[PDB]
Write a protein that binds this ligand. Structure first.
Ligand SMILES: [Mg+2]
Ligand SMILES: [Mg+2]
Ligand SMILES: [Mg+2]
Ligand SMILES: [Mg+2]
Ligand SMILES: [Mg+2]
Ligand SMILES: [Mg+2]
Ligand SMILES: [Mg+2]
Ligand SMILES: [Mg+2]
Ligand SMILES: [Zn+2]
Lengths: 137, 24, 83, 214, 135, 102
RNA sequence: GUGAAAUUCUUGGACCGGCGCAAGACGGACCAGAGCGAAAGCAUUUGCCAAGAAUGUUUUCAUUAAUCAAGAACGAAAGUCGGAGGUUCGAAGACGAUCAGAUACCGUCGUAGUUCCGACCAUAAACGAUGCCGACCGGCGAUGCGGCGGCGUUAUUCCCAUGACCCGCCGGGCAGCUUCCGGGAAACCAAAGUCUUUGGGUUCCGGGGGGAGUAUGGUUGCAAAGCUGAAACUUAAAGGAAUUGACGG
C-alpha cells in the first residue's frame, strides 16, 4: 500500500522499460511485466524547448532521471529493458538518446534486468518512403 | 541540352505537326 | 613441354584422358559376369547398366541403374570379360 | 485530480508447475468499481518472461508468453501461451556460407490446444572442412525439412499440453532433429524458434488447478 | 632535435674512411687533426662535423660491417668466421627419418637398402590445406 | 572507358538482381551493387557498460549484441567514408581491410 | 518532421504500451562476382502438370547440319482499355519551407499509377556498349552439376553401399588470378589471339560532325507511339584512349 507493493526487502519488484529511441525524439516508458499498465512516460520534447534537442543526450538523460524518481517514488526497484528503433521499413538502429538514457537509468538508483531488442523487423516490408532515387540532399 | 529532353521536345513538336496537318 | 610425344602416350595419361579425346577411342565401360547369390548360374551384366537385371533363378534384383554405373546387390561376385 | 496509482492495487502472478520457480513478478490494476471489474481487466494478460528466471540452471535465450486465465484473491494463476527465441540469439545464429532450413507444423494437442511450431536449423561445416561454404542441395533441404516436420508433430500430437511444455524446456525435439538429420546433412543450430497458440479448449478450470498442482 | 647529418658530411666521411682507414682511430680529436691534412675542408665547422661522423662510423665498423667497404676489411671478414668447426658434420645422422614414398624412390634409384635410414608410418588424414576463405 | 571489369557489381551469370534500399537515403540500388556492412555493436556503449553491469540484478549477465545488416548506395557510402576511392592499381585489391585486432 | 523549421495531428486522449480483428501489399537476414532460363526475368512451405541442360551410355537413325531475307513466338518498366482491389509508396496538384527569384531538390497531404485477371504497345545504358556454329593456341587455385577413382573422419548397424567432409581425374558451365602466346590507338582482351605470313562457314550492320531518327510516302496501333526512312542546307573538325598541369563545395 501507499503507492507501492508489500514486497519484502530481500525480493525486488520487476518492471519493464521500453526505450523507443528514434531520431528527433526519445521515449522512455515504464510499465508492468505484461506492459498493460503504464507508470510513467517521459520524452525529450517535454524537457527541452528548442525543438532540435528532442533526441539530444542532454534531454534523454533528463527524461530517464524523471522516470527514475517516479519509479522509486512508486516503489519499483528492478527494471527490464526493451530497446527499440523506428523499425518497420525505416531505420533499424537506435537513435543517439538510447545510450545516454540507459546510462542515466543505471546511475540514478535503479536495478537492471534483461536487455532485449523489440525493433519491428519485417520479413519483407512495404514500399519504403523516399522514391527510387533516394533523398537528394 | 540533354538528349532525352531533346527527344521529348521533338515528340511535342511532332504532336503539334500532326494536329495541324489533320486540321487542314 | 615443346616435345611431348603424342606418338606413344603412356598408359596412365591415356587413362587420364577423356574417352573421346584419346589417340584411339576406348570405351570406359566393360562387361562383367555376375553370380546370383543363393543360385548356380552366371549372368552377363553391363558395367553401366540402364535396365534392372534379374537372372532366372535369382528372383531378387541384381543391379540398380543409377547415373554412371549400376549398383551390384550385396553378395554378387563380378569379374571382367576379355577387356 | 489525484494520480490513479492511489486506487491501483498490486497482485502477484504465478507460474505453471513445469518450472521450479513459481513467482514471475507483480502486476497492478485498478480496483473493482461499477462497470469496470478488476478481475475482468486482468484476464488475458500476457507476461513475456524468461525461462532462465523461471528455472535454476537452464538457458537464458528463451521467453514465454504465459497468458493469465484465472485470479483468486491476490494471486493470478497462469498457463502456457507460447515460446519465442530472443532476437539476439536468432540473429547470432544466422551466419553466412551455410544453409538455413525453416519448417512449420500445425498440431492439435490431445488436451485441445491448437499450436503452430516453427523450427529452424543450420548446416554444419566439418572439423577437417577446407571448403569455404558448406551448403545443402535443394532435395537434401526438402528431406531435412520433411523429416523435421514429422519428428516434431509426432512429439506433440501424442501428448498433452503438460508434457509438451516440460519436454520443450530442454528441447528434446530439437536434439531429436539434430541426431536424426545427421544421416543426410549435419546440423548443430537446431532449435524450435517459436511456438504459438491458435485455439484453446473451452477454458476448463479443473485443468488449470491440476496444472498448478496435482 | 635536429642533429641529422647531411649527405655532404656523410659522403665526405665515407670516402676518407675507406681511403685512409689505418690512419684514423676511435678518438674524435685525432680524427679532426688527421682530417686537416688528408682533405681540404674550407670550414672548421664542416671539418669537425666530418670528424664526428668519422668517429661514429669507426665505432660502427669496429664491431660489424656497414654500407662502406674496405678492401682489407673484406679480407679480414672472410679470414675470420671460418666455421663453427663442429667435430662432426651436422648431416651425418646415425638414423634418418624417411617416408615410405622416398624409401621406394631410393629403391628404384637402386641406392636404397642402407642401414642409416629408417621408414616411418606415413601420416593419415591427407589434410594439408589451410581452411579457405576468412577464418 | 570501362573503369572496372565487373562494372562495380557481382552480376556474372544473371540478367536481373532484385533491388534493395539504401539505409541512409532510401535509394533503389541493385543488391549485388550496394555496399553491405554487417555490424555487431554493444547494446550499451563502453562509457556506460560498467554502470549497467553494476546495476544488474544478475550476478553474471552478458549484454546482447546488435545484428543489423546495412545497405549503402555508393553515394552515401562514400559520403560516410565506408569506402574510399583508391588508385588505379589499388582498385584491383579485393581483400577486406584489416580489423586492427593486434 | 527538418540543417533549422513550418504545413499537419493533438485534453475528443495525439504519440507510446498491451490484447485482438481486418485489408492489401511484400517475401529480409540465409542471399554469395552462387543456380536456372533464349532473353525479359526468376527467392515462404507443400502438392500437381508438363519442359530442360549436363553427366553416364560398346542403345538407336544415318548427314538428318550451321547461319539465316520474307514470316512468326516471347519481350523489364512506364503507357492504354475493361473489371475487381485499393495497404504502402507515389507522377499531376495543393500547401509549408529554402532562395534574389524556386514552377525543384526538403517536409505534409494526395489523384493517375503501383496489386490481380483479360485485351493491347513493342520500346530500355533490353549492356558483356562485345553475333552464332567450329578448330587451334599458356599456367594456377577455386566454385556449380554429373560421373569416375582413392589414406582416412563422421551418421546408423551387423558388413557394404548410401549421405556429410578429405585427396585427385574427366566433361559442361558461371567466373577469378597470373603470363613478353598474340593482338590492339591504348585502356585492356586467353580473346577483342591464330590479320599486309591478309580467305573455316555464315546473318546483321557502319562510312567526318550536324540537319535527323527530322520531313514525306507506306504500314501497325484505341491512343501515346512503333517499323521503314530521306533531302536542301551548314561546318573544319566532331570524337576515342592515354600523359602532364590546373582546379574541386
Ligand atoms: Mg550530395
Ligand atoms: Mg538488364
Ligand atoms: Mg504539430
Ligand atoms: Mg510491362
Ligand atoms: Mg486496369
Ligand atoms: Mg505519401
Ligand atoms: Mg560464319
Ligand atoms: Mg556521316
Ligand atoms: Zn544513399
Amino acid at each position: 500500500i501507499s503507492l507501492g507493493p508489500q514486497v519484502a526487502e530481500g525480493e525486488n519488484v520487476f518492471g519493464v522499460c521500453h526505450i523507443f529511441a528514434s531520431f528527433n525524439d526519445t521515449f522512455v516508458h515504464v510499465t508492468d511485466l505484461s506492459g498493460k499498465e503504464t507508470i510513467c512516460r517521459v520524452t525529450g520534447g517535454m524537457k527541452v524547448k528548442a525543438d532540435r534537442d528532442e533526441s539530444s543526450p542532454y534531454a534523454a538523460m533528463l527524461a530517464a532521471q524523471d522516470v527514475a524518481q517516479r519509479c522509486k517514488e512508486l516503489g519499483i526497484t528492478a527494471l527490464h529493458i526493451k530497446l527499440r528503433a523506428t523499425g518497420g521499413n525505416r531505420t533499424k538502429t537506435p537513435g543517439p538518446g538510447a545510450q545516454s538514457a540507459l546510462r542515466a537509468l543505471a546511475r540514478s538508483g535503479m536495478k537492471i534486468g534483461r536487455i532485449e531488442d523489440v525493433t519491428p523487423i519485417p520479413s519483407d516490408s512495404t514500399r519504403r518512403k523516399g522514391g527510387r532515387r533516394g533523398r537528394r540532399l | 541540352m540533354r538528349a532525352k529532353w531533346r527527344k521529348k521536345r521533338m515528340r511535342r513538336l511532332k504532336r503539334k505537326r500532326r494536329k495541324m496537318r489533320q486540321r487542314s | 613441354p615443346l616435345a611431348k610425344d603424342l606418338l606413344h602416350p603412356s598408359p596412365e595419361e591415356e587413362k587420364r584422358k577423356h574417352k573421346k579425346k584419346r589417340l584411339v577411342q576406348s570405351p570406359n565401360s566393360y562387361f562383367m559376369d555376375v553370380k546370383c547369390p543363393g543360385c548356380y548360374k552366371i549372368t552377363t551384366v553391363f558395367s553401366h547398366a540402364q535396365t534392372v537385371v534379374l537372372c532366372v533363378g535369382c528372383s531378387t534384383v541384381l543391379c540398380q541403374p543409377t547415373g554412371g554405373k549400376a549398383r551390384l546387390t550385396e553378395g554378387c561376385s563380378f569379374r571382367r570379360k576379355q577387356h | 485530480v489525484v494520480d490513479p496509482f492511489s486506487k491501483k492495487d498490486w497482485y502477484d502472478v504465478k507460474a505453471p508447475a513445469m518450472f521450479n520457480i513459481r513467482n514471475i513478478g507483480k502486476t497492478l490494476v485498478t480496483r473493482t468499481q461499477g462497470t469496470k471489474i478488476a478481475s475482468d481487466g486482468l484476464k488475458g494478460r500476457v507476461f513475456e518472461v524468461s525461462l532462465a528466471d523461471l528455472q535454476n540452471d537452464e538457458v537464458a535465450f528463451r521467453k514465454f508468453k504465459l497468458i493469465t486465465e484465472d485470479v483468486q484473491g491476490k494471486n493470478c494463476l497462469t498457463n502456457f501461451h507460447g515460446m519465442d527465441l530472443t532476437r539476439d540469439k536468432m540473429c547470432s545464429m544466422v551466419k553466412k556460407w551455410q544453409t538455413m532450413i525453416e519448417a512449420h507444423v500445425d498440431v492439435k494437442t490431445t488436451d485441445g490446444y491448437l499450436l503452430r511450431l516453427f523450427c529452424v536449423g543450420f548446416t554444419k561445416k566439418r572439423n577437417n572442412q577446407i571448403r569455404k561454404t558448406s551448403y545443402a542441395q535443394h532435395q537434401q533441404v526438402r528431406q531435412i525439412r520433411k523429416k523435421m516436420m514429422e519428428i516434431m508433430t509426432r512429439e506433440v500430437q501424442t501428448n498433452d499440453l503438460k508434457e509438451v511444455v516440460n519436454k520443450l524446456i530442454p528441447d528434446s525435439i530439437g536434439k531429436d532433429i539434430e541426431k536424426a538429420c545427421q544421416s543426410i546433412y549435419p546440423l548443430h543450430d537446431v532449435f524450435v524458434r517459436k511456438v504459438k497458440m491458435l485455439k484453446k479448449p473451452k477454458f476448463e478450470l479443473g485443468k488449470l488447478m491440476e496444472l498448478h498442482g496435482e | 632535435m635536429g642533429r641529422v647529418r647531411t649527405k655532404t658530411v656523410k659522403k665526405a666521411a665515407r670516402v676518407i674512411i675507406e681511403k685512409y682507414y689505418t690512419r684514423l682511430g676511435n678518438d674524435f680529436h685525432t680524427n679532426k687533426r688527421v682530417c686537416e691534412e688528408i682533405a681540404i675542408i674550407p670550414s672548421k665547422k664542416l671539418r669537425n662535423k666530418i670528424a664526428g661522423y668519422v668517429t661514429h662510423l669507426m665505432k660502427r665498423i669496429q664491431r660489424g660491417p656497414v654500407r662502406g667497404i674496405s678492401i682489407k676489411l673484406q679480407e679480414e671478414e672472410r679470414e675470420r668466421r671460418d666455421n663453427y668447426v663442429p667435430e662432426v658434420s651436422a648431416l651425418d645422422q646415425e638414423i634418418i627419418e624417411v617416408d615410405p614414398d622416398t624409401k621406394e624412390m631410393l629403391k628404384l634409384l637402386d641406392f636404397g637398402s642402407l642401414s642409416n635410414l629408417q621408414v616411418t608410418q606415413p601420416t593419415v588424414g591427407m589434410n594439408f590445406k589451410t581452411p579457405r576463405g576468412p577464418v | 572507358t570501362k573503369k572496372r571489369r565487373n562494372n562495380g557489381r557481382a552480376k556474372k551469370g544473371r540478367g536481373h538482381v532484385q533491388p534493395i534500399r539504401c539505409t541512409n537515403c532510401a535509394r533503389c540500388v541493385p543488391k549485388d551493387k550496394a555496399i553491405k556492412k554487417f555490424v555487431i555493436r554493444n547494446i550499451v556503449e563502453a562509457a556506460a557498460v560498467r554502470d549497467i553491469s553494476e546495476a544488474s540484478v544478475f550476478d553474471a549477465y552478458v549484454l546482447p549484441k546488435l545484428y543489423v545488416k546495412l545497405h549503402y548506395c555508393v553515394s552515401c557510402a562514400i559520403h560516410s567514408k565506408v569506402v574510399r576511392n583508391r588508385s588505379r592499381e589499388a582498385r584491383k585489391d579485393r581483400t577486406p581491410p584489416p580489423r586492427f585486432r593486434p
